[PDB]
C-alpha cells in the first residue's frame, strides 16, 4: 500500500508551495515508518537531484524542523547525532547523555557505536572518556559498549542472591560505597536478572536499590545509577516520567521531549502512553496539547499515535 515514489512527490509538492505546506509533511512522515521514511528520501533525491532531509531542512524551522530531520535519521544514526551533540563544545548534557546511554539495548549500542565512528570518525568510547571522568565516566564507558549479558533461560538463583548482597555490601553497609561493584553488576546482568537482583535486595536492605542509590552517590553518578534502575525495572514508565518532567513546569525542555517522541514512537510508545495515563491521570497526548501549539505539536501528537 506503502508508496515511496508518490510520498516522495507530495513532500516535493508541499515543500513548493507558496508558504511551504507544512501540514502534508507532517501528515506524511509522522505516520510512516522509520524504514519507509528512508525510501522515501531515497526515492525523493534520484527526483530532485538534492537530499530530502537538507531540502526539510531548508523549507522548515524551529522545533518542527528539528522534529522532522529527527525522523529522517535511522535509529542509529539519530542517536549517534544525539550523543555528539550532548558532548559538543565544552561541559556536558549529562542528562542527555545518561538518557541515552542507559536506555539502549545492546543491539542498539553496538549500531550506534559502528554508525558513530563512520559519521564522527572517531569512536563514541573515545569521546566518552574525553568528556567525563570518575566512576561517571566508568559507567557511562561500560554501558556504552553494548555487551550486557542476554537473556538467558534458566534462572541463576544462587547469583541472584550473590548480587544481592554484594550490592548491599557495597553501598548500604559500609563507609562510603563500592561504586566499581555496583557498576559490575548493574552493567554486566541481564535485565530480567537485575529485576530479580533487585528484588532480592530488598530482602536484605531497608531501603529498595533507588533509594540506596539515593542514599550513598550524589551529582552525576546518582543521576546515572537512578536512570538505569529505572530502565532496567520500567522502561516505559521511564520514559513516562521524563516525558512529564519535560512539560510539567514553565514551558517545555523540548530537546528532551522531541527526542523520547522520536526515538521511540516505533519501540514502545504503547507502554509508555499508558504507564503515564495509570500515572498522571491524563493522557501523554493532553500534556503534549497543552504544552505545544502549531505544526510541532501537530507532528508530537501523531508520534504519540492517539490519545488515551
Ligand atoms: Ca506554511
Ligand atoms: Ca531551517
Ligand atoms: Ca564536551
Ligand atoms: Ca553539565
Ligand atoms: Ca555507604
Ligand atoms: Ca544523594
Ligand atoms: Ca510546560
Not at 515511496?4 to 510512516?32: P, S, W
Not at 541463576?156 to 559490575?184: C, F, H, M, N
Amino acid at each position: 500500500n506503502f508508496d515511496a515514489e508518490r510520498d516522495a512527490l507530495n513532500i516535493e509538492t508541499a515543500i513548493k508551495t507558496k508558504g511551504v505546506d507544512e501540514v502534508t509533511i507532517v501528515n506524511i512522515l509522522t505516520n510512516r515508518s522509520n524504514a519507509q521514511r528512508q525510501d522515501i528520501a531515497f526515492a525523493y533525491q534520484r527526483r530532485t537531484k538534492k537530499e530530502l532531509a537538507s531540502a526539510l531542512k531548508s523549507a522548515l524551522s524551529g522545533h518542527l524542523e528539528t522534529v522532522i530531520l529527527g525522523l529522517l535519521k535511522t535509529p542509529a544514526q539519530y542517536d549517534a547525532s544525539e550523543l555528539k551533540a550532548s558532548m559538543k563544545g565544552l561541559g556536558t548534557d549529562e542528562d542527555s547523555l545518561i538518557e541515552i546511554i542507559c536506555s539502549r539495548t545492546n543491539q542498539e549500542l553496538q549500531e550506534i557505536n559502528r554508525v558513530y565512528k563512520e559519521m564522527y570518525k572517531t569512536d563514541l568510547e573515545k569521546d566518552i572518556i574525553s568528556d567525563t571522568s570518575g566512576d561517571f565516566r566508568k559507567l557511562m564507558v561500560a554501558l556504552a559498549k553494548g555487551r550486557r549479558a542476554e537473556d538467558g533461560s534458566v534462572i541463576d538463583y544462587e547469583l541472584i542472591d550473590q548480587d544481592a548482597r554484594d550490592l548491599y555490601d557495597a553501598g548500604v553497609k559500609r563507609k562510603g560505597t563500592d561504586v566499581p561493584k555496583w557498576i559490575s553488576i548493574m552493567t554486566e546482568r541481564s535485565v530480567p536478572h537485575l529485576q530479580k537482583v533487585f528484588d532480592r535486595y530488598k530482602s536484605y536492605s531497608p531501603y529498595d536499590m533507588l533509594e540506596s542509590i539515593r542514599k550513598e552517590v550524589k551529582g552525576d553518578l546518582e543521576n546515572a545509577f537512578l536512570n538505569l534502575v529505572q530502565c532496567i525495572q520500567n522502561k516505559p514508565l521511564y520514559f513516562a516520567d521524563r516525558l512529564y518532567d519535560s512539560m510539567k513546569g514553565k514551558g517545555t525542555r523540548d530537546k528532551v521531549l522531541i527526542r523520547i517522541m522520536v526515538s521511540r514512537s516505533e519501540v514502545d510508545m504503547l507502554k509508555i502512553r499508558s504507564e503515564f495515563k495509570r500515572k498522571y491521570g491524563k493522557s501523554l497526548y493532553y500534556y503534549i496539547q497543552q504544552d505545544t501549539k502549531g505544526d510541532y505539536q501537530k507532528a508530537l501528537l501523531y508520534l504519540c499515535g492517539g490519545d488515551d
